[PDB]
């Protein structure tokens, strides 16, 4: 068939990234482009990207009543014409290359521009197909028979800007809008007085207005404690307006799709739109070219599934040495990777450390970046457990590859996981996953590949008065869950899990065909 597709989000690897979001908006659009579709990605210009060149095409977008000049920077990479929205609110943010902290200064603290920024980002994204000729400035323009894939709350306003501004005036009529939920807790909930600044018609105010007792913290600077009233408050919600006007909802896992429809816990407070409209779970793939331990760049000894035992223990020595753990091939090696906050479950895992080293015997590597509390405790691991544990906060792409090939077991104690990528990455490289039993972790870590202890407790949640000194005995589920899995290290069962893990196929080729048909339905052909 072949059609025009336009991805719209707040991250694209390698340019911006705080986690999986960026990686999906790198991989998915390329693997769609391989099928013959004309694909584009649209992201903000947070920093002066050396490979991003000004198209010279400007436009003016109305925000907070004042017109705003924005520019459009372009780059063709892997058949995907990516575009970057240039403006002072994105580019001139707090310094040190941004990288992480795209959306806030600290972690838990957001920038008060975010309403206007992602209001600006969306409207601007709707211009790009109309007024920028690609690949070269003497080439064709994208046009109007274009499907928009929009990713999380940050691009949750393009369905409603599309209909309320553009389709009104007789363009993008053939165009449809797909929403893609990577996460449910992040909904773009803002105070109601930011309404004027959005520049949507007054009819469309009804779709943004929203009532709940849980609001994210006051958007000032220092506070990060979600206020909780008895009578529900009035506020905004970009994500609901994404659900209202999206011509289809997708999400990143069959199991997670189920958990969002399930009710106000699993849908945060938005369950009744998803359950009404429907949500197709398409689990995330991975890049096979990049993640391939038979042919990997960052590996000393490269190995297949036929030659695992040798290859891993070789790359484990490298790892043990690099972290500075005793170089013992018979000592188990558990690896944790994920952001340092409540969702990924560091706080409990770290409380569970003595039992993992002192009682089970294993070594524990710990990558992560996020809140100041858990970052502090991570660095001091190698002090308190000398040569039996390390905590790396701040790290490189290269450092995550050696960690997988070296680790015996990989650990994810998540409260919930829409899909997760570190367990997919591990299984590719033979590291046997010990996981929390939620979402994409349930779908991906089958019993043939790994272990699945029961999930970790949260509150009524989106980080309320977080982890009650009591509920933080979630720890014991990890102590227990690991004890089973590691008792069995060096079994023929373990060698079967190793082989099983790597024979699984995580390439997008399959996933894309599902994504591709969901388009055809929403359109017509
Ligand atoms: C990894 C994660 O990256 C992005 O998450 C952002 C939020 O989008 C952003 O709003 C911000 O969250 C803060 C929030 O705004 C505020 O209310 C609160 O006070 O503090 C929060 C934390 O500071 O920060 C995070 C991190 O920068 C994406 O938007 C998320 O969707 C994404 N997680 C997803 C993505 C994938 C990819 O498929 C899944 O595989 C993964 O399991 C899932 O968690
Ligand atoms: N603290 C971090 N900051 C930014 N990226 C990270 C961090 N920890 C891991 N990563 C990278 O992000 C991805 C992990 O994302 P995923 O497992 O989908 O869950 P989440 O997106 O919630 O972190 C991996 O590709 C890994 O390279």
Residue numbers in the entry: 18 to 542
From the paper:
SSs are retaining glycosyltransferases classified within the GT5 family in the Carbohydrate Active Enzyme (CAZy) database. Here we present three new crystal structures of SSs of different families and origins: the crystal structure of the catalytic domain of SSIV from Arabidopsis thaliana (AtSSIV), of GBSS from Cyanobacterium sp. CLg1 (CLg1GBSS) and of GBSSI from the glaucophyte Cyanophora paradoxa (CpGBSSI). In all cases, they are in the closed conformation forming ternary complexes with ADP in the donor site and the inhibitor acarbose occupying the donor glucose and glucose acceptor sites that approximates the active site at the time of the reaction.
The adenine is neither forming any hydrogen bonds (contacts less than 3.2 Å) nor tight stacking interactions, and consequently displays some mobility and slightly different conformations in both chains in the crystal. It is physically occupying the position that the adenine occupies in the other structures, thus its conformation is fully incompatible with the normal adenine binding mode. Thus, it is possible that the whole region has simply evolved under different evolutionary constraints in such a way as not to favor the stacking interaction between that phenylalanine and the adenine.
